[PDB]
Amino acid sequence: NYQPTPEDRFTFGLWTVGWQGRDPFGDATRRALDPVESVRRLAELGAHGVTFHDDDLIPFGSSDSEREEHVKRFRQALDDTGMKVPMATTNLFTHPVFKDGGFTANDRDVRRYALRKTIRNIDLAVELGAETYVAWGGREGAESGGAKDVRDALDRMKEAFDLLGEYVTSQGYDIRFAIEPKPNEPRGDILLPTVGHALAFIERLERPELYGVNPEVGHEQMAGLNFPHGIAQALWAGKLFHIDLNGQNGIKYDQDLRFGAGDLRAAFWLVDLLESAGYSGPRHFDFKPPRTEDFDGVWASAAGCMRNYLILKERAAAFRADPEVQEALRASRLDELARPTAADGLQALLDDRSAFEEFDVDAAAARGMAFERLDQLAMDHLLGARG
Amino acid sequence: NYQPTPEDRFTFGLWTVGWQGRDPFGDATRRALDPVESVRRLAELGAHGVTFHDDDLIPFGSSDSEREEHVKRFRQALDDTGMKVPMATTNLFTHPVFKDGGFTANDRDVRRYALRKTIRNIDLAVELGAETYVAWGGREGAESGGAKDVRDALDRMKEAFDLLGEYVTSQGYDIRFAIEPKPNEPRGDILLPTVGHALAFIERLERPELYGVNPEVGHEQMAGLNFPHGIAQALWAGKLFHIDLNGQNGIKYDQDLRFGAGDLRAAFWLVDLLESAGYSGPRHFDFKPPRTEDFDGVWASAAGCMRNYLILKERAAAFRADPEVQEALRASRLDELARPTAADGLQALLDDRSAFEEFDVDAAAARGMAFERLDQLAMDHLLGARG
Amino acid sequence: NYQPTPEDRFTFGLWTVGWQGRDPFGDATRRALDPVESVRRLAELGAHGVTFHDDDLIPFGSSDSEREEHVKRFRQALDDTGMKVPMATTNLFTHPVFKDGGFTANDRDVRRYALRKTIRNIDLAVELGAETYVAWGGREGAESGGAKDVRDALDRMKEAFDLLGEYVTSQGYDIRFAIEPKPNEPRGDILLPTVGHALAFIERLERPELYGVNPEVGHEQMAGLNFPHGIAQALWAGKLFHIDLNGQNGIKYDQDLRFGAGDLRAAFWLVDLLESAGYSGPRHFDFKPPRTEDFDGVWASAAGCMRNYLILKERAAAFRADPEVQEALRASRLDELARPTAADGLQALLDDRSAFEEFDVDAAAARGMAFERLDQLAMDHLLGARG
Amino acid sequence: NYQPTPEDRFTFGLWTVGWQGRDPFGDATRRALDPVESVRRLAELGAHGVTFHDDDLIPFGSSDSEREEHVKRFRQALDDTGMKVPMATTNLFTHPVFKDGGFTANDRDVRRYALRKTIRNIDLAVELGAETYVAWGGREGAESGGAKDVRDALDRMKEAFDLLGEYVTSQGYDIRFAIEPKPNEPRGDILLPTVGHALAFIERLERPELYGVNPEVGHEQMAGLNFPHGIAQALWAGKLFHIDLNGQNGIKYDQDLRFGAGDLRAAFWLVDLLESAGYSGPRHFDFKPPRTEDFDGVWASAAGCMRNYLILKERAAAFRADPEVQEALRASRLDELARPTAADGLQALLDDRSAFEEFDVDAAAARGMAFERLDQLAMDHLLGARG
Ligand SMILES: OC[C@H]1O[C@H](O)[C@H](O)[C@@H](O)[C@@H]1O
Ligand SMILES: OC[C@H]1O[C@H](O)[C@H](O)[C@@H](O)[C@@H]1O
Ligand SMILES: OC[C@H]1O[C@H](O)[C@H](O)[C@@H](O)[C@@H]1O
Ligand SMILES: OC[C@H]1O[C@H](O)[C@H](O)[C@@H](O)[C@@H]1O
Ligand SMILES: [Mn+2]
Ligand SMILES: [Mn+2]
Ligand SMILES: [Mn+2]
Ligand SMILES: [Mn+2]
Ligand SMILES: [Mn+2]
Ligand SMILES: [Mn+2]
Ligand SMILES: [Mn+2]
Ligand SMILES: [Mn+2]
């Protein structure tokens, strides 16, 4: 009955289940959680681990002794439960000093501060065992055209990521970076707005091998993009270092519904791809239990994330294992798509009359793709309606 | 009075002014144009040049002698007018054989055919003087999840572009490639859906220096993205080889309004960026005169493309030259955004107490960005309402 | 195994399965169907009926004898199969004369012509047994602000619908009208763009009781609206005269995927509502088998429409019948939402201190809605994963 | 130089300039304003008036004496400045008790409380001279399908508005209601999501003449709708009681940019319509100075709202007064759109052979609409580029 265990690698941000329900139009509807209680409740549901921003774990402004006690208690809860911390990140968005950005703030002093605040937390992340360090440039961008020269901003972004790569290399840390795209919100337009923009940017860094992406289901959907396509491109590039799983209903504010909510068919095709490709990172949920909910509803929502992943994984596996689907996939020439177009080489292609002068374009045109039949087999699998 | 001349480098696709007004719900409202007449009418309006798909210039299915006559007449009109042909491209979308794609069709034979059809037209393009060869993968993608393994598809896309780079290198041609993104339409989701995805893909090709992007105003807007931001990223990467200028009202079907229509402020910020960055390629319009229009309306629409570019160029130049705007730009710290964050290096940043231990975060936070004032100066410039 | 029969009331437009696959960027990929063959193939799949535009059944420009023969053959196929014709409509979009609209064309002569063309087809529709006559104002609107004074246009729309109501009343026909909204495409913005706009407009007609809506799943989704919410408002108003069922992936061009594709959860909640409310009209599919498909794929796609409706109907029924869901619905106070807020009346509400002066707002606030648990029960039902 | 004065009727919400800059991802960047200071600063900029939610003017939880002092001080500032209060509204969204709605909360007690809280503020609004009372059902809706039966919810909405109409009638108040649509945010989908849905709903209330709409530029744009079209429909219905003016860049979170920002051409066509139709209500701004800004930037942003309205009003007036535009409007048959289609009546239309049997559809089809030329005249006017 789709019961998660820690071997499923399901992780949650402290800020997910810990969200107090403050939105732009309303006050908190739940009390703050102690991170220790979250670790414990998550462990009991079958989670593998948690993730954190610096400021989720240690209140902004903490003294050294406060900080040490917060980490001690957190460490104890990890030890008490067997929970891991596979990823951490910096809060470069909440404090008003970040109003125009961290790494790409117009104020140089803010940019230096952002870097120092990040580096401090990289050390903690390594201490707690994290393998991935996420950057989410939520304040990087603009509401107006004159406010942000984007080429200068990208020069500053590159400089910041380059410094961080220098830093981790200097300490001999194994931790890698993952850039999390989001196209807008809270800035009118955010820099590196999609998986593609982040991938492209990475290839200009000094040490590109240190940086991948942390794509979020809802964020690519906020641009109307196909999330499984973006993930496939990321996998193709060898850069799917981490993922954020959740739900989103179309192009609107960032909803952060529980995974499986939102675009259910996209969630099926995502799980199909992750499993087929052998993604081996954390199955991380970045979701907000709706503010309608009390604490019991919080845990139900979190449980549903993991349940939905496990149901979808079962249905996708059944799909790809069904001989009738295997025959449909052949009928639709998915096998041919996987073959080289011209392993014979350029000159042979140019000399091949069956590729042009004698290619019967009408007979090719007339051959149906059989994609609808294929897709209804997939529907029938997803819904458990195989006849 | 904003009169274009050929030195402004304004170009038009044959298929733009030549669009007969057939849409998915209706028949043509205008007769087909002879390319010769289009060259002549465009020249008379002050255009620099035209662009073409193979099948715009030579009807699909033409005999060798037909083809030779079509090119002869076209060449004569170019010679008669002084018009250039800076760019060409392949029609890999109209014929039913391309229903599942060209380069990423599931049918291998179709993929080979697509390559041969492209290579034939590369030779013609070079003969007519083109410097850029555009690819627009409009049929590459899917309506359903099972129909297209995207990693295999990207393997096939890479293979196709690699073969084309091999081909041009083999002939000693100077022509370069530009990939034109579009996120959807006519496929439910199109591969390389944005400028970012195309940039990232390019970095995996064998000879990345041969490939840039041809971003279109309306296409990035179809994903709700900020077109001037995308162009800036493209410029940052050194990959703005060509551009398509037009208008689009938000996230909907591809409207291809005349340039300046649609998102007028985005058009102002685009022209500001292109001019500030010194983009020196063609100012190419990919637009559709609405099907409401007759031939006189066609030419009025095309004239308006060039007029709007020239008005915006004047207003943007006035903006950046106004000492009052220069002072506002300083007040908003755009000068600081252009300075390195830490030219002193990593260790100096780590040892700089003013970056962290003694950084007054509240005083920084309290400093307004003054972006609204800046933006109203920009509004006042755009509208010619300076007091 | 979810086999449809005619008692399920599933209907298809001739133009759905008959779509030849011409899109704005490509030629037809299938031959034209004879309406007789469509009736027969649909009947064999378990359909109840078909619908038509005038010009689907009788080619535009037909002679009286041609017209009579087309109708004869169609009638014979209906008689041969037991198929019905519950709805008909006018093509006021394809011919170039409708380029600026039918009923709201700027040219008065076009507007009169649109009315005459509609009235002719109303007579045929009644002859073939239709109970609903759909209007889809696809050409009514604008690409630019100056082209269409919308108040004058709505005066013309009202005039046209009023004349049609006069006409049907004059003939003693029982047929009613249903306005089908679409927000854009093929016009940049279409008048009466949503269910709400159409409902509101209807209340200004001379005989509002003669007019309802024909909402389409994909069209409301093209504005990012919640289709089941729109249907509920339509049901609330007593105006759900007919429906178009299909799928759509977000805000983009009108995709017309088979029903169940697109937003699968919205399709579940739609079927839940239609069945719960006792909608008794046709379950009509307005879909396009993708142009990738051959004729076999056409019929598979159409079969899948009906299959998906039947699977969803089963899952929704199981949901609402499950005692555990009934208890969750109580826990979430859906029973209370159905009770009057103040059946005691205004003065009693004003005098009720428990409504204000002594209302414990914090205790109310603290009561979780339990909506996540409810929603995962719904997920588990939809997926057939009840434990 | 486009200097506003109180005769321009420009109004601002206390919550607009008073927004402290808290967003879902960050803390306030400005201190709270005293409403008295806002009245004074707004008056100095040339505003006519302010608007308020109950809880903007009197802190939630105030004692009777606190309340009396808050109103006293506010009244004094109004008297000191000559500012008016043309509109007021209720906060039925901030307090956690409204997490599932006010008027359509599932909890009946919450619904009664919402009504009492509204009625209390109606009395204050009348005391301060307001002519319009706005309802914005921001918490009315759902994130999941099972949580909200929408027909029951609309029964509750109708009941609430009916009670409020009973109340104002009982007191002999002249104040009227205006429903402000928003399609989503903070609920996943909000009930009455557009101008159309609100118009339609109004026609089912007991006393429909008491209720109009308060459409907001950005909210209709959040559904990709054409705001000037929606306003025209509202004007057509006689229901434009009040308006919210601001800017929005497409389909995304509710940005509330200063008026003129966002979609500049839509702002031009809006002002053209409001002025042409003789809208005589407040020109009310519901905007958020971006959180990047300090207090000086707040006032600059607010000034820019009024400036942009005045520039657009000048350009639109020049457009409609230009004899060359008047001739273009005739060329495009806008004069004909304003004439009745068939003032001769139904039988005469049926007997008119020039409407059908002898209508030359090809000659009509061939007549260009000349809309592009018209639209470039409008562009040239907007930009001050008339040659
Ligand atoms: O980077 C970690 C997280 O930071 C913030 O909480 C963002 O809203 C979220 O999307 C991101 O995944
Ligand atoms: O690639 C050349 C052109 O091909 C097609 O006409 C596309 O619709 C267009 O966007 C593109 O710019
Ligand atoms: O009105 C009947 C039909 O006409 C057209 O085919 C439209 O594209 C479709 O949505 C509509 O349902
Ligand atoms: O109803 C008054 C106002 O309430 C809230 O502040 C809303 O966010 C806003 O759009 C609305 O106009
Ligand atoms: Mn998110
Ligand atoms: Mn995230
Ligand atoms: Mn385009
Ligand atoms: Mn293009
Ligand atoms: Mn449709
Ligand atoms: Mn339809
Ligand atoms: Mn708003
Ligand atoms: Mn508002």
CSV table of C-alpha atoms in Angstrom, one decimal, chain C residues 65-332:
chain,number,residue,atom,x,y,z
C,65,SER,CA,-29.9,19.6,-55.8
C,66,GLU,CA,-26.4,19.0,-54.4
C,67,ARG,CA,-27.6,20.1,-51.0
C,68,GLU,CA,-30.6,17.8,-51.2
C,69,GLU,CA,-28.5,14.8,-52.0
C,70,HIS,CA,-26.0,15.5,-49.2
C,71,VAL,CA,-28.8,15.6,-46.7
C,72,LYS,CA,-30.4,12.5,-48.2
C,73,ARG,CA,-27.3,10.5,-47.8
C,74,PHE,CA,-26.6,11.8,-44.3
C,75,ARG,CA,-30.3,11.0,-43.3
C,76,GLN,CA,-29.8,7.4,-44.6
C,77,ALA,CA,-26.7,6.9,-42.5
C,78,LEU,CA,-28.5,8.2,-39.4
C,79,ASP,CA,-31.4,5.8,-40.2
C,80,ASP,CA,-28.9,2.9,-40.9
C,81,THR,CA,-27.2,3.4,-37.5
C,82,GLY,CA,-29.7,4.8,-35.1
C,83,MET,CA,-27.5,7.9,-34.6
C,84,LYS,CA,-29.0,11.2,-33.6
C,85,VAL,CA,-28.1,14.9,-34.3
C,86,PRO,CA,-28.6,16.7,-31.0
C,87,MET,CA,-26.9,20.0,-32.0
C,88,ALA,CA,-25.9,22.0,-35.0
C,89,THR,CA,-24.1,25.3,-35.7
C,90,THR,CA,-23.1,27.7,-38.4
C,91,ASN,CA,-19.7,28.2,-40.0
C,92,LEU,CA,-19.2,31.9,-39.6
C,93,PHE,CA,-15.4,31.7,-39.6
C,94,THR,CA,-13.9,29.9,-42.6
C,95,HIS,CA,-14.9,32.0,-45.5
C,96,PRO,CA,-12.8,35.1,-46.0
C,97,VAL,CA,-15.9,37.3,-46.0
C,98,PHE,CA,-15.9,36.6,-42.2
C,99,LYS,CA,-12.4,37.9,-41.7
C,100,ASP,CA,-13.7,40.6,-39.3
C,101,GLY,CA,-16.6,38.6,-38.0
C,102,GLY,CA,-20.1,37.5,-38.8
C,103,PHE,CA,-22.6,39.0,-36.4
C,104,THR,CA,-20.1,41.8,-35.4
C,105,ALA,CA,-18.3,42.5,-38.6
C,106,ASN,CA,-17.7,46.1,-39.2
C,107,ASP,CA,-19.4,45.7,-42.7
C,108,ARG,CA,-23.1,45.8,-42.2
C,109,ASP,CA,-23.7,43.7,-45.3
C,110,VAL,CA,-21.6,40.9,-43.8
C,111,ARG,CA,-23.6,41.0,-40.6
C,112,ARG,CA,-26.8,40.6,-42.6
C,113,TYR,CA,-25.3,37.7,-44.5
C,114,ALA,CA,-24.2,36.0,-41.4
C,115,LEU,CA,-27.7,36.1,-40.0
C,116,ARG,CA,-29.2,34.7,-43.2
C,117,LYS,CA,-26.6,31.9,-43.4
C,118,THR,CA,-27.5,31.1,-39.7
C,119,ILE,CA,-31.2,31.1,-40.2
C,120,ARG,CA,-31.0,28.8,-43.2
C,121,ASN,CA,-29.1,26.3,-41.1
C,122,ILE,CA,-31.5,26.6,-38.1
C,123,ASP,CA,-34.2,25.2,-40.4
C,124,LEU,CA,-32.0,22.2,-41.4
C,125,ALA,CA,-31.0,21.6,-37.8
C,126,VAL,CA,-34.7,21.4,-36.7
C,127,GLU,CA,-35.4,19.1,-39.7
C,128,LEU,CA,-32.6,16.7,-38.5
C,129,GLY,CA,-33.8,16.8,-34.9
C,130,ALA,CA,-31.4,19.1,-33.2
C,131,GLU,CA,-32.4,20.5,-29.8
C,132,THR,CA,-29.5,23.0,-29.4
C,133,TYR,CA,-28.1,25.4,-31.9
C,134,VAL,CA,-24.5,26.6,-31.0
C,135,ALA,CA,-22.9,29.9,-31.8
C,136,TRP,CA,-19.2,30.2,-31.7
C,137,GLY,CA,-18.1,33.8,-32.5
C,138,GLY,CA,-14.5,32.8,-33.4
C,139,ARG,CA,-14.1,35.9,-35.8
C,140,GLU,CA,-15.7,38.3,-33.4
C,141,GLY,CA,-13.0,40.6,-31.9
C,142,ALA,CA,-9.8,42.3,-32.9
C,143,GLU,CA,-6.1,42.3,-33.1
C,144,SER,CA,-5.9,46.1,-32.5
C,145,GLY,CA,-7.7,48.6,-30.2
C,146,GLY,CA,-9.0,51.0,-32.8
C,147,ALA,CA,-10.6,48.3,-35.1
C,148,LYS,CA,-13.5,47.3,-32.9
C,149,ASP,CA,-15.6,49.5,-30.7
C,150,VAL,CA,-16.7,46.8,-28.2
C,151,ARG,CA,-19.9,48.4,-27.0
C,152,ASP,CA,-21.0,48.9,-30.6
C,153,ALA,CA,-20.0,45.3,-31.2
C,154,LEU,CA,-22.0,44.0,-28.3
C,155,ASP,CA,-25.0,46.1,-29.6
C,156,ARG,CA,-24.6,44.2,-32.9
C,157,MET,CA,-24.2,40.8,-31.1
C,158,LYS,CA,-27.3,41.4,-29.1
C,159,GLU,CA,-29.2,42.5,-32.2
C,160,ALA,CA,-28.2,39.3,-34.0
C,161,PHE,CA,-29.1,37.0,-31.2
C,162,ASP,CA,-32.4,38.8,-30.6
C,163,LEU,CA,-33.3,38.3,-34.4
C,164,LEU,CA,-32.5,34.7,-34.1
C,165,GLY,CA,-34.8,34.3,-31.0
C,166,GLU,CA,-37.5,36.2,-32.9
C,167,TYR,CA,-37.0,33.8,-35.8
C,168,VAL,CA,-37.3,30.6,-33.9
C,169,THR,CA,-40.3,31.9,-31.9
C,170,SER,CA,-41.9,32.9,-35.2
C,171,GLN,CA,-41.5,29.3,-36.5
C,172,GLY,CA,-42.7,27.7,-33.2
C,173,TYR,CA,-39.4,25.8,-33.0
C,174,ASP,CA,-38.3,24.2,-29.7
C,175,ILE,CA,-34.6,24.6,-30.4
C,176,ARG,CA,-32.6,26.7,-28.0
C,177,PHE,CA,-29.3,28.6,-28.5
C,178,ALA,CA,-26.0,28.0,-26.7
C,179,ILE,CA,-23.1,30.5,-26.9
C,180,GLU,CA,-19.7,28.8,-26.9
C,181,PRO,CA,-16.9,31.0,-25.4
C,182,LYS,CA,-13.3,31.2,-26.5
C,183,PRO,CA,-10.9,33.9,-25.3
C,184,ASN,CA,-8.6,34.2,-28.3
C,185,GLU,CA,-7.7,32.4,-31.5
C,186,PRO,CA,-8.1,33.1,-34.4
C,187,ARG,CA,-8.7,36.8,-33.3
C,188,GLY,CA,-6.2,38.4,-31.0
C,189,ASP,CA,-9.0,38.8,-28.4
C,190,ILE,CA,-12.5,37.3,-29.0
C,191,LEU,CA,-15.7,38.9,-27.7
C,192,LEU,CA,-17.5,37.1,-24.8
C,193,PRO,CA,-14.2,35.4,-24.0
C,194,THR,CA,-15.3,33.1,-21.1
C,195,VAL,CA,-18.4,31.4,-19.6
C,196,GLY,CA,-18.9,34.4,-17.3
C,197,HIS,CA,-18.9,37.0,-20.2
C,198,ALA,CA,-21.4,34.9,-22.1
C,199,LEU,CA,-23.7,34.3,-19.1
C,200,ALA,CA,-23.7,38.1,-18.4
C,201,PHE,CA,-24.4,38.9,-22.1
C,202,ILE,CA,-27.3,36.5,-22.2
C,203,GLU,CA,-29.1,38.4,-19.4
C,204,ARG,CA,-29.3,41.5,-21.7
C,205,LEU,CA,-31.1,39.6,-24.6
C,206,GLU,CA,-34.8,40.1,-25.2
C,207,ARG,CA,-35.7,36.5,-24.3
C,208,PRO,CA,-32.9,35.3,-22.1
C,209,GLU,CA,-34.6,31.9,-21.4
C,210,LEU,CA,-33.9,30.9,-25.0
C,211,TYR,CA,-30.0,31.1,-24.6
C,212,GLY,CA,-27.4,29.2,-22.6
C,213,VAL,CA,-23.8,28.3,-22.9
C,214,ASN,CA,-21.8,25.6,-24.6
C,215,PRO,CA,-18.5,25.8,-22.5
C,216,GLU,CA,-15.5,23.9,-23.9
C,217,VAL,CA,-12.9,22.4,-21.5
C,218,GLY,CA,-9.9,23.7,-23.4
C,219,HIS,CA,-11.3,27.3,-24.0
C,220,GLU,CA,-11.7,28.2,-20.4
C,221,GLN,CA,-8.3,26.7,-19.8
C,222,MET,CA,-6.8,28.9,-22.4
C,223,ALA,CA,-7.5,31.7,-20.0
C,224,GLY,CA,-6.1,29.7,-17.0
C,225,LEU,CA,-9.6,29.4,-15.5
C,226,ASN,CA,-10.9,26.4,-13.6
C,227,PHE,CA,-13.3,24.6,-16.0
C,228,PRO,CA,-15.3,22.7,-13.3
C,229,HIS,CA,-15.8,26.1,-11.5
C,230,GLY,CA,-17.2,27.7,-14.7
C,231,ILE,CA,-19.4,24.7,-15.3
C,232,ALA,CA,-20.7,25.0,-11.7
C,233,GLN,CA,-21.5,28.7,-12.3
C,234,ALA,CA,-23.3,27.8,-15.5
C,235,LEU,CA,-25.3,25.0,-13.7
C,236,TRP,CA,-26.1,27.5,-10.9
C,237,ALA,CA,-27.5,29.9,-13.5
C,238,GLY,CA,-29.6,27.1,-15.2
C,239,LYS,CA,-27.7,27.6,-18.5
C,240,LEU,CA,-25.6,24.5,-19.2
C,241,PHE,CA,-27.5,23.6,-22.4
C,242,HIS,CA,-24.6,21.7,-24.0
C,243,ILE,CA,-20.9,21.1,-23.4
C,244,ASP,CA,-17.7,20.5,-25.4
C,245,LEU,CA,-15.4,17.9,-23.9
C,246,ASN,CA,-11.7,17.7,-24.8
C,247,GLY,CA,-8.2,18.3,-23.3
C,248,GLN,CA,-5.8,21.2,-23.2
C,249,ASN,CA,-2.4,21.6,-21.6
C,250,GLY,CA,-2.5,25.1,-20.2
C,251,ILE,CA,-2.4,28.5,-21.7
C,252,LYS,CA,-1.5,28.1,-25.3
C,253,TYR,CA,-3.1,27.7,-28.7
C,254,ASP,CA,-6.4,25.6,-28.7
C,255,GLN,CA,-5.1,22.1,-28.7
C,256,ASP,CA,-8.4,20.1,-28.7
C,257,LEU,CA,-6.8,16.9,-27.3
C,258,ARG,CA,-9.0,13.9,-26.7
C,259,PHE,CA,-11.0,14.1,-23.5
C,260,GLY,CA,-9.0,12.9,-20.5
C,261,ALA,CA,-5.8,14.2,-22.0
C,262,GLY,CA,-4.6,17.5,-20.8
C,263,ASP,CA,-5.6,18.3,-17.3
C,264,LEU,CA,-6.6,14.9,-16.0
C,265,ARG,CA,-7.6,16.0,-12.5
C,266,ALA,CA,-9.8,18.7,-14.0
C,267,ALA,CA,-11.5,16.1,-16.1
C,268,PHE,CA,-12.2,14.0,-13.0
C,269,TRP,CA,-13.7,16.9,-11.1
C,270,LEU,CA,-15.7,17.9,-14.3
C,271,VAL,CA,-17.2,14.4,-14.5
C,272,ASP,CA,-17.9,14.4,-10.8
C,273,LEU,CA,-19.8,17.6,-11.2
C,274,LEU,CA,-21.8,16.8,-14.3
C,275,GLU,CA,-22.9,13.5,-12.8
C,276,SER,CA,-23.6,14.9,-9.4
C,277,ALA,CA,-25.6,17.8,-10.9
C,278,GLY,CA,-27.5,15.5,-13.2
C,279,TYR,CA,-26.5,17.2,-16.4
C,280,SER,CA,-28.7,15.4,-19.0
C,281,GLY,CA,-27.5,16.9,-22.3
C,282,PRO,CA,-25.1,15.4,-24.8
C,283,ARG,CA,-21.6,14.4,-23.8
C,284,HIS,CA,-20.2,16.1,-26.8
C,285,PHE,CA,-16.5,15.8,-27.9
C,286,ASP,CA,-14.9,18.7,-29.8
C,287,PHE,CA,-11.4,17.3,-30.3
C,288,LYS,CA,-8.8,16.9,-33.0
C,289,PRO,CA,-7.1,13.6,-33.5
C,290,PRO,CA,-3.5,14.9,-33.8
C,291,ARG,CA,-2.1,15.3,-37.3
C,292,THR,CA,0.5,12.6,-36.5
C,293,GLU,CA,-2.2,10.0,-36.8
C,294,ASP,CA,-3.7,8.0,-39.6
C,295,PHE,CA,-7.4,6.9,-39.8
C,296,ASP,CA,-6.9,4.1,-37.5
C,297,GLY,CA,-5.4,6.6,-35.0
C,298,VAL,CA,-8.5,8.9,-35.6
C,299,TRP,CA,-10.9,6.2,-34.4
C,300,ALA,CA,-8.6,5.2,-31.5
C,301,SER,CA,-8.5,8.8,-30.3
C,302,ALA,CA,-12.3,9.1,-30.5
C,303,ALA,CA,-12.7,5.8,-28.6
C,304,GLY,CA,-10.4,7.1,-25.9
C,305,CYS,CA,-12.6,10.2,-25.4
C,306,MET,CA,-15.6,7.9,-24.4
C,307,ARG,CA,-13.4,5.5,-22.4
C,308,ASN,CA,-11.9,8.2,-20.3
C,309,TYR,CA,-15.3,9.7,-19.6
C,310,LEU,CA,-16.5,6.2,-18.4
C,311,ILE,CA,-13.4,5.6,-16.2
C,312,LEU,CA,-13.7,9.0,-14.6
C,313,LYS,CA,-17.4,8.6,-14.0
C,314,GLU,CA,-16.7,5.2,-12.2
C,315,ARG,CA,-14.0,6.8,-10.0
C,316,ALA,CA,-16.0,9.8,-9.1
C,317,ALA,CA,-19.0,7.8,-8.2
C,318,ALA,CA,-16.8,5.5,-6.0
C,319,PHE,CA,-15.4,8.7,-4.4
C,320,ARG,CA,-18.7,10.2,-3.4
C,321,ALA,CA,-20.1,6.7,-2.3
C,322,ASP,CA,-17.2,5.9,-0.1
C,323,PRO,CA,-18.3,6.3,3.7
C,324,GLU,CA,-14.7,7.3,4.4
C,325,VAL,CA,-15.0,10.2,1.9
C,326,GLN,CA,-18.4,11.0,3.3
C,327,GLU,CA,-16.9,11.4,6.8
C,328,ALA,CA,-14.0,13.5,5.4
C,329,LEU,CA,-16.5,15.8,3.6
C,330,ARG,CA,-18.2,16.3,7.0
C,331,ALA,CA,-14.8,16.9,8.7
C,332,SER,CA,-14.1,19.6,6.1
